[PDB]
């Protein structure tokens, strides 16, 4: 039982840390994504 505790505890901790890093990546992509479309849209405004 005690051993399971420790093992399970570790998992939870790891999961928590994992989430954090993913969040960071997500935010980056989000910002990056937006910028791209704007540029393309601006290109359309110059297409005429």
């Amino acid at each position: 039982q005690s051993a399971r505790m420790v093992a399970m505890k570790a998992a939870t901790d790891n999961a928590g840390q994992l989430i954090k890093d993913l969040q960071l990546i997500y935010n980056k992509l989000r910002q990056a994504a937006i910028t791209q479309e704007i540029s393309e849209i601006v290109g359309g405004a110059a297409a005429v």
Partner: protein, 463 residues
Amino acid sequence: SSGRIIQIIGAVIDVEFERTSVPKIYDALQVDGTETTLEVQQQLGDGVVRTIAMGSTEGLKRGLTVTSTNAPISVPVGTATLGRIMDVLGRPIDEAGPVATEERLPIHRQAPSYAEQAASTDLLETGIKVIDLLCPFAKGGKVGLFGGAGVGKTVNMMELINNIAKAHSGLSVFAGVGERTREGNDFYHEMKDSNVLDKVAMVYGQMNEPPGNRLRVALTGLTMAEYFRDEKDENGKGRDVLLFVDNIYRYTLAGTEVSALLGRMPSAVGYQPTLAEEMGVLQERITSTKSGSITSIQAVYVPADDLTDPSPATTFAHLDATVVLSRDIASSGIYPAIDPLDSTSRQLDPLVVGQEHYEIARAVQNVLQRYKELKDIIAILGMDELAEEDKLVVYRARKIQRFFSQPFHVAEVFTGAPGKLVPLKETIRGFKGLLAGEYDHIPEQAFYMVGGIDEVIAKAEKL
């Protein structure tokens, strides 16, 4: 001399003047026969000026005359604005009559120069134990309020408004940028009911208003606060002034909308190209001159829970203290509800505040962090099963948590208990005594809503 509208597209309006008499940037114009005002925003060729109207363009046609004021938007400044509600143009919206002040000031002005800065950094005493001890404020500083609704955000604002006038004989100015009308009415009526309206001046820019109104509503409050600061009483000494910003994120959003309306290449994350400059225009006029000081309290909203977003990133470069309100503490029953571990201040250093204050604050923060680390072990492994020092840390942390709470003065007409303003020295002495261990036998229930330390002793011996 006079102009005429030549183009109407939404809010953007193009006006044509004479070859010579072309109004400068940021000048204010007024369309005759209508209650419409325009703000110069860009200068083009052939004496054509691109402006944004403060108001609505419905029922407007090309060929209407325009008269130039040859000056920026001027607002009335004085002591007759204490207890009134005005819009961006300084017009009453409370149906209480015209403001008797006859002297006006422009809202566009350069920041004070390099040689006009204060020769030292002096702390500001508020009377709230937790704010003074762990997030000390500075005359000319800036505080960012991170909190949701239902955590007592307005009550704290009113308490600070009362405390400054009671202690430092100062005044306050409130500016609402893009606020809801319902909450504005509620706030005004709460101020009237609590009797703090007399010491404050209020300016509202509504959410249903065009972005031009919401963008230029903070400068009016800034101008009023600046006039309050430089008023010289006998023997000079100026005055200390508070300024309030209901939300600064909406200021940046209004700037973005205005930039998009005028038409220019978007920056990263769709922000306008001139973001940091626009914010530094606002945040560099809030400082402590030789005559007196202005301190600003601003509410900050983080979009998409992203601290890396350009708007909060630009905001955080000017903030000196951060006050965080947590729902967890409010449920626990400890008001005011300010987190003592997520709240930070740049003035908490041994140089500005001293050595003993720094030591006491760091010790309290360390004890709180230790308690935060130990709760989980008690929760899962079990109660007790631990050495004595941990248990002593837990008991002291609980006593400190109870001791942080204090009654306020703006709630006297509701609960009936008088408010307590605690001088810093009393807080320092009480916390040092608690950390020493003298009050290791006093019941913790005497630390709740009890104000100063001696008062704790009296409540304990009475019980």
